[PDB]
Design an enzyme around this catalytic site. Structure first.
Site, short mmCIF file in Angstrom:
data_model
loop_
_atom_site.label_atom_id
_atom_site.label_comp_id
_atom_site.label_asym_id
_atom_site.label_seq_id
_atom_site.Cartn_x
_atom_site.Cartn_y
_atom_site.Cartn_z
N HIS A 178 12.35 21.35 44.51
CA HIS A 178 11.33 20.90 45.44
C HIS A 178 9.95 20.86 44.63
O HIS A 178 9.22 22.13 44.57
CB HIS A 178 11.06 21.45 46.89
CG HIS A 178 10.55 20.92 47.61
ND1 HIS A 178 9.40 19.96 47.28
CD2 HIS A 178 10.49 21.01 48.81
CE1 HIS A 178 8.88 19.55 48.08
NE2 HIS A 178 9.33 20.03 49.35
N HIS A 181 5.18 17.66 47.57
CA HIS A 181 4.05 18.00 48.69
C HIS A 181 3.27 19.14 48.84
O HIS A 181 3.24 19.71 50.05
CB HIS A 181 5.28 17.85 49.95
CG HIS A 181 6.03 16.93 49.94
ND1 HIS A 181 7.38 16.79 50.19
CD2 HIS A 181 5.71 15.53 49.99
CE1 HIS A 181 7.78 15.52 50.49
NE2 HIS A 181 6.90 14.68 50.25
N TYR A 183 3.50 22.09 47.63
CA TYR A 183 4.16 23.38 47.44
C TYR A 183 3.87 23.95 45.98
O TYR A 183 2.98 23.60 45.24
CB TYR A 183 5.55 23.41 47.93
CG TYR A 183 5.59 22.95 49.30
CD1 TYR A 183 4.96 23.75 50.30
CD2 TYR A 183 6.29 21.78 49.73
CE1 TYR A 183 4.85 23.33 51.60
CE2 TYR A 183 6.26 21.26 51.45
CZ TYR A 183 5.63 22.09 52.07
OH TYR A 183 5.59 21.58 53.17
C1 LIG Z 1 10.73 15.76 60.06
C2 LIG Z 1 10.75 15.91 58.65
C3 LIG Z 1 10.99 16.73 57.58
C4 LIG Z 1 10.94 16.68 56.22
N1 LIG Z 1 11.15 17.93 55.48
C5 LIG Z 1 11.21 17.55 54.04
C6 LIG Z 1 11.74 18.75 53.10
O1 LIG Z 1 12.16 19.79 53.69
N2 LIG Z 1 11.67 18.49 51.76
C7 LIG Z 1 11.09 17.30 51.12
O2 LIG Z 1 10.97 17.05 49.79
N3 LIG Z 1 10.58 16.26 52.06
C8 LIG Z 1 10.79 16.33 53.58
N4 LIG Z 1 10.33 15.34 54.21
C9 LIG Z 1 10.00 14.02 53.60
C10 LIG Z 1 11.04 13.42 53.52
O3 LIG Z 1 12.14 13.81 52.83
C11 LIG Z 1 11.18 11.76 52.98
O4 LIG Z 1 10.31 11.66 51.93
C12 LIG Z 1 10.30 11.18 54.17
O5 LIG Z 1 11.27 11.09 55.10
C13 LIG Z 1 9.85 9.33 53.47
O6 LIG Z 1 10.98 8.84 54.03
P1 LIG Z 1 11.10 7.78 55.68
O7 LIG Z 1 9.98 6.83 55.51
O8 LIG Z 1 12.50 7.24 55.60
O9 LIG Z 1 11.04 8.93 56.72
C14 LIG Z 1 10.51 15.58 55.69
C15 LIG Z 1 10.10 14.54 56.72
C16 LIG Z 1 10.36 14.38 57.90
C17 LIG Z 1 9.77 13.29 58.93
#
Ligand SMILES: Cc1cc2nc3c(=O)[nH]c(=O)nc-3n(C[C@H](O)[C@H](O)[C@H](O)COP(=O)(O)O)c2cc1C
Length: 353
Positions: A178, A181, A183
């Protein structure tokens, strides 16, 4: 029957033979009580497994100091490793390929989550300002992190190494580092955050050393063909922006070519493009961020990615691949239950066609 589409095309990634390009994006759902994976996740990931379909699990914490949210799973204890196994087996039972996303929040935390009320760790000593939690009712506060010392960093790098090993012990086909974002890893990369004067700060090269040392430790530990990494050069989450996202992105992909990874996962910016990075990167490129069936197909066709990850839509559609493959209607997703804690509601109650 139905006309074949780009998203349903087979693909060779790392040492794996994928049957399609719809990838389950990493999704933190906060339903892992006590930082231990749970039985309900078995059903969740099972509802979303397909033969030769790739799944990237929710961000999994690598150590006690990497906790910044309630009920997120960890993978540093035997108890956690055993809890993941039945989940991994259920995905495998349908033929899916499962990667564990390993994570450390760095400064995105509070002393109440830290062992002994210790301060969170980061590349800087500057903390975050308050944020409103998902429910729009609660305010999340953060403790100022302590700036890790130069020779202490390798120990942190080692935590990703052990985590990676543990994921393999749990049965995961591989791990995704990871690095996005805002982190810990991203905190080191982004110039608006990294204010170090040692070899882990200043130049674009020093700021990426941490991530690169991590990629190196993990690849050596479990094999580079079982390793992926995610980055978000353009994202500003958790006050982690960079004054030159494009070069930062180009630097990282070019630096990752020497490692022979399973893939590079880059998040689309919410000008700025991933095209250059896709061009400079020699391996499998996974993109994510705001896609639908149409944009997915177009990205594949226009050579903008080899795999397209879906988040929100995969939350509400257990059978997203099938739905795209038949161009069938899609269930709407309810953001109100994205991060809520019920074992069923908003997690596994979304219907199949
Ligand atoms: C509820 C939720 C939880 C997420 N948790 C993570 C995570 O644990 N790690 C990560 O790298 N991105 C996380 N993301 C970002 C997503 O992996 C992804 O980049 C994001 O959903 C973009 O795509 P979408 O438009 O299809 O939703 C999260 C997004 C949402 C909405």
């Amino acid at each position: 029957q139905v006309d074949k589409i780009p998203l349903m095309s087979p693909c060779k990634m790392g040492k794996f033979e994928l049957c399609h390009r719809v990838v389950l994006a990493p999704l933190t759902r906060q339903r892992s009580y006590g930082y231990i994976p749970q039985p309900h996740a078995i059903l969740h990931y099972s509802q979303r497994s397909t033969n030769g379909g790739l799944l990237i699990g929710e961000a999994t914490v690598i150590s006690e100091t990497g906790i910044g949210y309630k009920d997120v799973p960890g993978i540093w204890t035997k108890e956690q490793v055993e809890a993941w196994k039945p989940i991994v087996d259920a995905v495998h039972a349908k033929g899916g390929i499962f990667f564990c996303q390993i994570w450390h929040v760095g400064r995105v935390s509070n002393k109440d989550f830290q062992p002994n009320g210790e301060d969170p760790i980061s590349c800087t000593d500057r903390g975050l300002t308050p944020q409103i939690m998902s429910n729009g009712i609660d305010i999340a506060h953060f403790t100022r992190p302590r700036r890790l010392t130069t020779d202490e960093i390798p120990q942190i790098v080692n935590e990703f190494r052990v985590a990676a090993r543990n994921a393999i012990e749990a049965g995961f086909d591989g791990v995704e580092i990871h690095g996005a974002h805002g982190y810990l890893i991203d905190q080191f990369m982004k110039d608006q955050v990294n204010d170090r004067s040692d070899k882990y700060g200043g130049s674009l090269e020093n700021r990426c050393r941490f991530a690169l040392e991590i990629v190196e430790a993990v690849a050596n530990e479990i094999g580079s063909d079982r390793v992926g990494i995610r980055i978000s050069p353009f994202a500003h989450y958790n006050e982690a922006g960079d004054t030159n996202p494009t070069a930062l992105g180009l630097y990282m992909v070019e630096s990752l070519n020497k490692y022979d990874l399973a893939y590079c996962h880059v998040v689309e910016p919410r000008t700025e493009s991933l095209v250059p990075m896709r061009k400079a990167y020699k391996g499998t490129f996974i993109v994510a961020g705001g896609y639908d069936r149409e944009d997915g197909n177009r990205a594949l066709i226009e050579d903008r990615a080899d795999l397209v990850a879906y988040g929100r839509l995969f939350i509400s559609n257990p059978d997203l691949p099938k739905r795209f493959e038949l161009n069938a209607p899609l269930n709407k997703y309810n953001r109100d239950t994205f991060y809520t804690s019920d074992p069923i509601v908003g997690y596994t109650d979304y219907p199949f066609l």
